[PDB]
Amino acid sequence: NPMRELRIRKLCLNICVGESGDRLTRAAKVLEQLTGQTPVFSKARYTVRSFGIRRNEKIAVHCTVRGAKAEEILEKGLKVREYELRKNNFSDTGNFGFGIQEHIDLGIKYDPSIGIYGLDFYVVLGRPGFSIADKKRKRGVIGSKHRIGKEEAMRWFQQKYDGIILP
RNA sequence: GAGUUUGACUGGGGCGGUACACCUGUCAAACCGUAACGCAGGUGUCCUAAGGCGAGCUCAGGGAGGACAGAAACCUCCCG
Numbered sequence: 001n002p003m004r005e006l007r008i009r010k011l012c013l014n015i016c017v018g019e020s021g022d023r024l025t026r027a028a029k030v031l032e033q034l035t036g037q038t039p040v041f042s043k044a045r046y047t048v049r050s051f052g053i054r055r056n057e058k059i060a061v062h063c064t065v066r067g068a069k070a071e072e073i074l075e076k077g078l079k080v081r082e083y084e085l086r087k088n089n090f091s092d093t094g095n096f097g098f099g100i101q102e103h104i105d106l107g108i109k110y111d112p113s114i115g116i117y118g119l120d121f122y123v124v125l126g127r128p129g130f131s132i133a134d135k136k137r138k139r140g141v142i143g144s145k146h147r148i149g150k151e152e153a154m155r156w157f158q159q160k161y162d163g164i165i166l167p
Numbered sequence: 168g169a170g171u172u173u174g175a176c177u178g179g180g181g182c183g184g185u186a187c188a189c190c191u192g193u194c195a196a197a198c199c200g201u202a203a204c205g206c207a208g209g210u211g212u213c214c215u216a217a218g219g220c221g222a223g224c225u226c227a228g229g230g231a232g233g234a235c236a237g238a239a240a241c242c243u244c245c246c247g
Protein backbone atom coordinates (compact mmCIF):
# COMPACT_ATOMS: atom_id res chain seq x y z
CA ASN A 1 0.00 0.00 0.00
CA PRO A 2 1.16 3.57 -0.70
CA MET A 3 1.10 4.33 3.05
CA ARG A 4 4.55 2.75 3.53
CA GLU A 5 6.62 4.75 1.02
CA LEU A 6 9.90 5.90 2.54
CA ARG A 7 10.47 9.64 2.25
CA ILE A 8 12.72 12.40 3.56
CA ARG A 9 11.22 13.88 6.72
CA LYS A 10 13.97 16.46 7.25
CA LEU A 11 17.56 17.14 6.24
CA CYS A 12 19.47 18.46 9.25
CA LEU A 13 22.67 20.35 8.41
CA ASN A 14 25.18 21.08 11.17
CA ILE A 15 28.34 23.21 11.22
CA CYS A 16 29.91 22.75 14.66
CA VAL A 17 32.63 25.39 14.97
CA GLY A 18 35.21 25.06 17.73
CA GLU A 19 34.74 28.63 18.95
CA SER A 20 32.43 31.64 18.72
CA GLY A 21 33.08 35.14 17.40
CA ASP A 22 33.67 36.21 13.81
CA ARG A 23 34.59 32.60 13.03
CA LEU A 24 31.06 31.52 13.98
CA THR A 25 29.08 34.27 12.24
CA ARG A 26 30.75 33.35 8.95
CA ALA A 27 29.43 29.78 9.17
CA ALA A 28 25.94 31.20 9.76
CA LYS A 29 26.01 32.88 6.35
CA VAL A 30 27.14 29.59 4.77
CA LEU A 31 23.96 27.77 5.80
CA GLU A 32 21.92 30.81 4.75
CA GLN A 33 23.31 30.63 1.21
CA LEU A 34 22.71 26.87 1.00
CA THR A 35 19.41 26.39 2.85
CA GLY A 36 17.96 29.81 2.05
CA GLN A 37 16.85 30.34 5.65
CA THR A 38 18.14 31.81 8.89
CA PRO A 39 20.28 29.33 10.88
CA VAL A 40 20.01 28.61 14.60
CA PHE A 41 22.97 29.03 16.94
CA SER A 42 23.59 26.21 19.43
CA LYS A 43 25.09 27.20 22.76
CA ALA A 44 27.44 24.85 24.58
CA ARG A 45 25.78 22.68 27.22
CA TYR A 46 28.77 22.36 29.57
CA THR A 47 32.25 23.88 29.75
CA VAL A 48 35.35 22.06 28.48
CA ARG A 49 38.85 23.41 29.07
CA SER A 50 40.45 21.30 26.34
CA PHE A 51 37.84 22.17 23.72
CA GLY A 52 38.00 25.83 24.75
CA ILE A 53 34.22 26.22 25.06
CA ARG A 54 32.24 27.98 27.79
CA ARG A 55 28.76 27.19 29.05
CA ASN A 56 25.88 28.87 27.18
CA GLU A 57 28.17 30.00 24.35
CA LYS A 58 27.14 29.62 20.71
CA ILE A 59 29.59 27.24 19.05
CA ALA A 60 27.50 25.73 16.26
CA VAL A 61 24.78 26.52 13.73
CA HIS A 62 22.15 24.14 12.39
CA CYS A 63 19.22 24.14 9.97
CA THR A 64 16.54 21.71 8.81
CA VAL A 65 14.79 21.46 5.43
CA ARG A 66 11.52 19.60 4.85
CA GLY A 67 10.11 19.98 1.33
CA ALA A 68 11.64 19.57 -2.10
CA LYS A 69 14.47 21.90 -1.07
CA ALA A 70 15.70 19.15 1.25
CA GLU A 71 16.03 16.81 -1.73
CA GLU A 72 17.91 19.58 -3.56
CA ILE A 73 20.50 20.05 -0.80
CA LEU A 74 20.83 16.28 -0.36
CA GLU A 75 21.43 15.78 -4.09
CA LYS A 76 24.20 18.39 -3.97
CA GLY A 77 25.64 16.69 -0.89
CA LEU A 78 25.51 13.20 -2.35
CA LYS A 79 27.14 14.46 -5.55
CA VAL A 80 30.24 15.54 -3.62
CA ARG A 81 30.35 12.14 -1.90
CA GLU A 82 30.09 10.50 -5.37
CA TYR A 83 26.79 8.94 -4.23
CA GLU A 84 28.53 6.37 -2.03
CA LEU A 85 28.15 5.93 1.73
CA ARG A 86 29.71 3.41 4.08
CA LYS A 87 27.46 0.74 5.56
CA ASN A 88 27.96 2.11 9.09
CA ASN A 89 26.53 5.51 8.11
CA PHE A 90 23.00 4.09 8.42
CA SER A 91 21.66 3.98 11.97
CA ASP A 92 19.44 1.19 13.27
CA THR A 93 16.58 3.68 13.73
CA GLY A 94 16.26 4.09 9.94
CA ASN A 95 18.30 7.28 9.44
CA PHE A 96 21.73 7.98 8.00
CA GLY A 97 24.16 10.82 7.41
CA PHE A 98 27.50 11.85 5.98
CA GLY A 99 30.05 14.63 6.32
CA ILE A 100 31.22 17.25 3.83
CA GLN A 101 34.73 18.60 4.36
CA GLU A 102 34.26 21.85 2.40
CA HIS A 103 31.17 23.87 1.47
CA ILE A 104 32.73 25.10 -1.79
CA ASP A 105 31.82 21.78 -3.45
CA LEU A 106 28.12 22.19 -2.59
CA GLY A 107 27.70 25.16 -4.94
CA ILE A 108 28.89 28.09 -2.83
CA LYS A 109 31.66 30.06 -4.52
CA TYR A 110 34.74 30.71 -2.41
CA ASP A 111 35.33 34.24 -1.12
CA PRO A 112 38.31 35.66 0.79
CA SER A 113 36.00 37.22 3.39
CA ILE A 114 34.53 34.01 4.85
CA GLY A 115 36.70 30.96 5.43
CA ILE A 116 36.06 27.37 4.41
CA TYR A 117 33.72 25.27 6.55
CA GLY A 118 32.65 21.63 6.73
CA LEU A 119 29.02 20.61 7.11
CA ASP A 120 27.30 17.58 8.66
CA PHE A 121 24.56 16.17 6.43
CA TYR A 122 22.09 13.94 8.27
CA VAL A 123 18.88 12.64 6.66
CA VAL A 124 15.87 11.64 8.77
CA LEU A 125 13.66 9.21 6.87
CA GLY A 126 10.04 8.34 7.59
CA ARG A 127 6.81 6.85 6.32
CA PRO A 128 3.49 8.69 5.95
CA GLY A 129 2.09 8.42 9.46
CA PHE A 130 5.22 9.11 11.49
CA SER A 131 3.63 12.35 12.75
CA ILE A 132 1.45 10.50 15.28
CA ALA A 133 4.37 10.41 17.74
CA ASP A 134 4.88 14.18 17.47
CA LYS A 135 1.38 15.65 17.80
CA LYS A 136 -0.03 16.70 21.16
CA ARG A 137 -3.65 15.51 20.88
CA LYS A 138 -3.82 11.71 21.14
CA ARG A 139 -0.11 10.99 20.77
CA GLY A 140 0.79 7.39 20.00
CA VAL A 141 3.78 5.22 19.17
CA ILE A 142 4.69 4.47 15.56
CA GLY A 143 4.54 0.67 15.75
CA SER A 144 6.89 -2.25 15.22
CA LYS A 145 5.92 -3.11 11.63
CA HIS A 146 5.95 0.59 10.64
CA ARG A 147 9.25 2.00 11.94
CA ILE A 148 12.12 2.06 9.45
CA GLY A 149 15.00 -0.35 10.00
CA LYS A 150 18.60 -0.22 8.86
CA GLU A 151 17.89 -2.55 5.93
CA GLU A 152 15.03 -0.50 4.49
CA ALA A 153 17.13 2.65 4.87
CA MET A 154 20.04 1.19 2.89
CA ARG A 155 17.70 -0.27 0.27
CA TRP A 156 16.02 3.13 -0.12
CA PHE A 157 19.43 4.71 -0.73
CA GLN A 158 20.26 2.07 -3.36
CA GLN A 159 16.99 2.75 -5.23
CA LYS A 160 16.25 6.49 -5.21
CA TYR A 161 19.86 7.51 -5.90
CA ASP A 162 21.25 4.12 -7.01
CA GLY A 163 24.13 4.71 -4.63
CA ILE A 164 26.87 2.24 -3.74
CA ILE A 165 27.22 1.11 -0.12
CA LEU A 166 30.70 -0.02 0.86
CA PRO A 167 31.16 -2.77 3.50
C1' G B 168 41.66 57.32 93.98
C1' A B 169 36.09 55.74 94.26
C1' G B 170 31.98 52.56 93.05
C1' U B 171 30.59 48.26 90.56
C1' U B 172 30.88 44.11 87.21
C1' U B 173 33.63 39.96 85.43
C1' G B 174 26.46 34.85 81.94
C1' A B 175 24.53 29.99 82.17
C1' C B 176 24.47 24.97 80.84
C1' U B 177 28.37 21.28 82.43
C1' G B 178 29.00 12.99 84.51
C1' G B 179 33.17 18.49 90.21
C1' G B 180 35.29 22.87 88.35
C1' G B 181 38.24 25.16 84.55
C1' C B 182 39.68 24.57 79.38
C1' G B 183 36.78 22.83 75.05
C1' G B 184 32.00 22.66 73.08
C1' U B 185 26.70 25.55 72.59
C1' A B 186 23.49 20.37 73.33
C1' C B 187 21.45 28.86 75.03
C1' A B 188 17.03 31.07 69.56
C1' C B 189 15.77 27.74 65.26
C1' C B 190 15.36 23.21 61.00
C1' U B 191 15.76 17.94 58.76
C1' G B 192 16.58 12.42 59.41
C1' U B 193 16.88 9.22 63.52
C1' C B 194 16.64 7.91 68.53
C1' A B 195 10.97 7.39 69.60
C1' A B 196 9.25 1.42 71.35
C1' A B 197 3.35 2.10 63.87
C1' C B 198 -1.57 8.79 66.75
C1' C B 199 0.69 13.07 68.93
C1' G B 200 4.42 13.72 72.77
C1' U B 201 9.14 11.88 74.88
C1' A B 202 15.49 12.79 77.58
C1' A B 203 21.30 12.74 77.52
C1' C B 204 27.85 17.25 76.34
C1' G B 205 22.56 10.61 71.90
C1' C B 206 23.66 9.95 66.37
C1' A B 207 24.20 12.39 61.03
C1' G B 208 23.58 17.45 59.30
C1' G B 209 21.84 22.60 58.53
C1' U B 210 20.84 28.17 60.09
C1' G B 211 21.78 34.35 61.25
C1' U B 212 21.35 33.80 54.23
C1' C B 213 19.63 34.01 49.06
C1' C B 214 15.94 35.90 45.13
C1' U B 215 12.63 41.87 40.50
C1' A B 216 12.51 36.76 40.22
C1' A B 217 14.64 32.07 42.11
C1' G B 218 7.67 36.35 43.37
C1' G B 219 2.68 35.95 40.27
C1' C B 220 0.15 34.12 35.90
C1' G B 221 -0.36 31.86 31.06
C1' A B 222 1.62 29.14 27.11
C1' G B 223 4.76 25.64 24.89
C1' C B 224 8.36 22.18 26.01
C1' U B 225 10.68 17.44 28.89
C1' C B 226 14.78 15.75 32.33
C1' A B 227 19.34 12.30 34.36
C1' G B 228 21.40 8.68 31.58
C1' G B 229 21.94 5.11 27.60
C1' G B 230 21.96 2.96 22.37
C1' A B 231 22.71 3.82 17.27
C1' G B 232 24.38 7.54 14.06
C1' G B 233 26.84 12.12 11.63
C1' A B 234 33.47 16.49 8.32
C1' C B 235 37.29 18.17 11.68
C1' A B 236 35.48 15.60 16.53
C1' G B 237 38.73 12.18 20.20
C1' A B 238 36.55 8.71 26.71
C1' A B 239 33.72 14.22 27.07
C1' A B 240 31.96 20.15 21.86
C1' C B 241 27.45 20.06 18.24
C1' C B 242 23.43 17.77 14.89
C1' U B 243 19.72 13.52 14.44
C1' C B 244 16.74 9.37 15.89
C1' C B 245 15.20 5.73 19.56
C1' C B 246 14.63 4.07 24.63
C1' G B 247 14.12 6.67 29.02
Ligand SMILES: [Mg+2]
Ligand atom coordinates in the same frame (compact mmCIF):
# COMPACT_ATOMS: atom_id res chain seq x y z
MG1 LIG C 1 33.58 44.61 95.19
Ligand SMILES: [Mg+2]
Ligand atom coordinates in the same frame (compact mmCIF):
# COMPACT_ATOMS: atom_id res chain seq x y z
MG1 LIG D 1 28.62 27.61 86.54
Ligand SMILES: [Mg+2]
Ligand atom coordinates in the same frame (compact mmCIF):
# COMPACT_ATOMS: atom_id res chain seq x y z
MG1 LIG E 1 5.34 8.74 67.58
